[PDB]
């Protein structure tokens, strides 16, 4: 084999031999086609310290970006997590209105290996974005929102933390929800509106909202984008008042109902999650939210909750570098950087009519 033959010369060239005077032997190269993070296993007599000392040389020799070098099952075996020099993805990519999709309902979240990541909300209607504080899971949601505002959609924004993440400029573009009573009224309305559109399609004999809009002129239904900053504000019922938790259990009722029956009604949920918990990302939320955006999660348990795999732990530590799952396949992408005080121009959306 070519790889074993290649690696052998790279080691001979570095005189990278153990106490036994023998070069590391390649046990397995497990390449990921989706994330494109390869897993290079070697068993040598060289200690993990000497390996780490050689990461800059090993990168230049094998032409790889070493994500991590860890010790395997035995103190003889090492595992390298890397990406070839050809798995080229920007380390930083800002937002540009040039990316805004023409097709009403298609949104672009960033750049991948082969092209850009696109989500058609007529096909995949709900997005679950997850990541630690400062990962940029909010940035994505704001960018999806901007693209939909530009597409002329109705926007609702949920942030129970005084609505600080949805400032006075966001307020101009749509309704901002800050309390459980407002969220109760909003989610009840969203279920009623979803059901209202559900019968219009039945009666009109139209597949989606677009197929009805081309049948009724002055009665055109606009897309509804409802972004939730922290699912846990609606999910996590622990601590609140006896009357407040009946309100939260109603919000949870309506949310489940929204995610389940709103593929054709053009009502979309974009949910951010800081702390992936099974009490928050319920199987009802999982079964009905098809789009998964995942930041680097140190734990294997938090990644399984989100992606239904342990891929988030192998993410190269790059600000805005996420994982993307839709259906079975899981891919690596660099999320566009959406700067609020650079790209969010609320008057450009008010001009739209
Ligand atoms: N795509 C990106 N490229 C480069 N840097 C990024 C990117 N996304 C985020 N960052 C940086 O990290 C910061 C984190 O911002 P952000 O508020 O979106 O993250 P968050 O804490 O996970 O979400 P939230 O506000 O909902 O708590 C950004 O302000 C920016 O400095
Ligand atoms: O929050 C619910 C309210 O949202 C508004 O955008 C609508 O115009 C109202 O009809 C609705 O009752």
């Amino acid at each position: 084999d070519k790889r074993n033959a290649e690696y052998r010369l790279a080691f001979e060239q570095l005189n990278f031999v153990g106490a036994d005077s023998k070069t590391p032997i390649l046990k397995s190269f497990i390449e990921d086609k989706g994330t494109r993070i390869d897993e290079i296993t070697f068993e040598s007599m060289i200690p993990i310290e000497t390996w780490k000392s050689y990461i800059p040389q090993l990168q230049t020799s094998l032409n790889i970006s070493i994500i991590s070098i860890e010790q395997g099952a035995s103190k003889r075996i090492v595992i390298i997590k890397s990406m070839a020099g050809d798995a080229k993805i920007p380390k930083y990519l800002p937002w540009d209105d040039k990316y805004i999709e023409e097709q009403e309902g298609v949104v672009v979240v960033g750049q991948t290996f082969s092209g850009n990541i696109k989500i058609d909300l007529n096909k995949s209607p709900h997005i679950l974005s997850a990541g630690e504080t400062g990962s940029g899971k909010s940035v994505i949601l704001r960018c999806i929102l901007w693209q939909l505002l530009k597409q002329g959609a109705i926007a609702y924004m949920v942030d129970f933390k005084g609505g600080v993440e949805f400032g006075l400029e966001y307020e101009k573009v749509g309704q901002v929800i800050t309390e459980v009573d407002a969220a109760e009224k909003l989610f009840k309305y969203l279920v009623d509106e979803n059901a209202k559109r559900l019968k219009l399609l039945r009666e009109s004999g139209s597949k989606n909202i677009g197929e009805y809009n081309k049948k009724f002129e002055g009665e055109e239904l606009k897309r509804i984008i409802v972004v939730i900053d922290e699912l846990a504000e609606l999910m996590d019922k622990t601590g609140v008042d006896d009357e407040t938790r009946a309100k939260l259990v109603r919000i949870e009722g309506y949310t489940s109902t929204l995610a389940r029956l709103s593929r054709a009604t053009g009502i979309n949920l974009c949910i951010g999650v800081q702390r992936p918990d099974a009490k928050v990302i319920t199987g009802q939320i999982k079964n009905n939210v098809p789009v998964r955006i995942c930041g680097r999660f140190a734990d294997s348990k938090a990644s399984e909750i989100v992606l239904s795999n342990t891929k988030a732990k192998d993410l190269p530590e790059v600000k805005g570098r996420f994982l993307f799952k839709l259906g079975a396949d899981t891919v690596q992408f660099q999320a566009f950087y959406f700067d609020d005080d650079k790209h969010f121009i609320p008057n450009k959306i008010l001009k739209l009519r």
Side-chain angles (χ1 to χ4, degrees), residues 154 156 175 177 182 185-187 189-190:
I154 308 158
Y156 299 105
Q175 205 179 76
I177 307 313
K185 315 309 167 282
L186 167 72
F187 276 98
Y189 158 74
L190 299 171

Side-chain angles (χ1 to χ4, degrees), residues 209-306:
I209 51 152
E211 212 173 290
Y212 168 87
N213 294 334
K214 64 111 190 175
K215 297 181 183 177
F216 287 85
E217 199 86 81
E219 315 307 304
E220 280 170 64
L221 317 159
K222 300 183 178 178
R223 188 171 301 278
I224 300 210
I225 177 64
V226 53
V227 282
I228 303 126
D229 188 78
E230 185 44 67
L231 187 50
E233 299 182 331
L234 310 177
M235 286 309 301
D236 185 34
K237 298 151 209 175
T238 69
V240 307
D241 291 297
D242 39 50
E243 201 66 68
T244 299
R245 72 178 301 110
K247 275 179 182 59
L248 281 173
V249 85
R250 248 113 64 178
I251 319 301
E252 189 206 25
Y254 305 132
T255 291
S256 162
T257 305
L258 263 182
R260 222 187 318 114
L261 301 118
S262 70
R263 188 185 243 91
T265 62
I267 296 129
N268 315 112
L269 315 153
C270 288
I271 315 145
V273 201
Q274 193 220 298
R275 217 173 311 282
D277 199 317
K279 289 157 237 286
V280 183
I281 311 159
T282 138
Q284 289 174 38
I285 257 139
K286 277 192 86 153
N287 270 342
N288 305 133
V289 313
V291 189
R292 312 277 174 80
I293 264 100
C294 204
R296 188 188 99 180
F297 278 106
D299 210 301
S300 307
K301 293 166 266 124
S303 185
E304 280 274 344
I305 292 164
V306 179

Side-chain angles (χ1 to χ4, degrees), residues 63-109:
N63 184 42
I64 49 148
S65 315
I66 289 153
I67 309 169
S68 59
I69 309 189
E70 323 109 87
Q71 192 91 62
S74 65
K75 225 202 175 75
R76 271 273 262 262
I77 194 145
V78 292
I79 280 91
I80 298 173
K81 298 298 295 178
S82 67
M83 291 170 64
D86 293 350
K88 305 169 234 278
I89 42 183
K91 283 168 274 182
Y92 171 75
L93 183 59
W95 170 253
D96 200 294
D97 286 0
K98 76 193 177 97
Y99 304 123
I100 287 158
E101 268 303 318
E102 271 265 291
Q103 187 157 102
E104 199 286 337
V106 187
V107 307
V108 191
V109 284

Side-chain angles (χ1 to χ4, degrees), residues 91-94 131-142 161 165 229-230 272 274 318-322 334-339:
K91 283 168 274 182
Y92 171 75
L93 183 59
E132 286 143 9
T133 324
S135 56
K137 58 154 202 57
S138 172
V139 154
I140 301 187
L141 293 186
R142 301 208 243 217
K161 314 158 230 59
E165 272 285 319
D229 188 78
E230 185 44 67
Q274 193 220 298
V318 177
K319 227 152 293 152
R321 191 72 56 80
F322 283 91
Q334 174 64 28
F336 297 135
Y337 179 46
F338 185 83
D339 214 322

